[PDB]
Design a protein around this ligand. Sequence first.
Ligand SMILES: Nc1nc2c(ncn2[C@@H]2O[C@H](COP(=O)(O)OP(=O)(O)O)[C@@H](O)[C@H]2O)c(=O)[nH]1
Length: 164
Amino acid sequence: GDYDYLIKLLALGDSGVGKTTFLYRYTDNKFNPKFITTVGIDFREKRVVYDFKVHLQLWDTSLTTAFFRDAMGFLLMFDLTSQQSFLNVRNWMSQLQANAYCENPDIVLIGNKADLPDQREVNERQARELAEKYGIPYFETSAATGQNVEKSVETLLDLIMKRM
Ligand SMILES: Nc1nc2c(ncn2[C@@H]2O[C@H](COP(=O)(O)OP(=O)(O)O)[C@@H](O)[C@H]2O)c(=O)[nH]1
């Protein structure tokens, strides 16, 4: 423990895609909360109610902002075996840009579950184009195998190190 930079990367994408497994494979056992408190503003009032006097609280229908907080690079991720998750990239990208530190931060496009060719619904060309539309690297990965799992974070880190 004698380094020089501490930098934050965010993985974002639909449930299933392999974020949890991807990181887990890229890292190895780190079940450790970083933590703070969180607000829950709620109104209150002191009603009287004969059948007593009741005080009562009034709640209503967050952390998201706290996740994109400081995130200097993004792993935009989908499931190669799911045409649906590929389409949702359009939408994770939207709320990414809305929350990030900058309008175009550093994203690497990750197609995961590359080890399931039999179950594929997303083609190389498709992704490559979206990637280029946005103008960012693309990586076909597997959390199961390790395919490109490192190269993808590394291409990300390498990018977030362009300064001035
Ligand atoms: N074969 C394969 N399975 C995967 C891969 N990534 C995730 N999975 C599986 O997908 C399921 C859910 O993915 P998980 O990462 O845990 O949830 P997520 O973080 O929301 O994407 C688990 O049963 C994993 O075994 C992959 O790259 N290859």
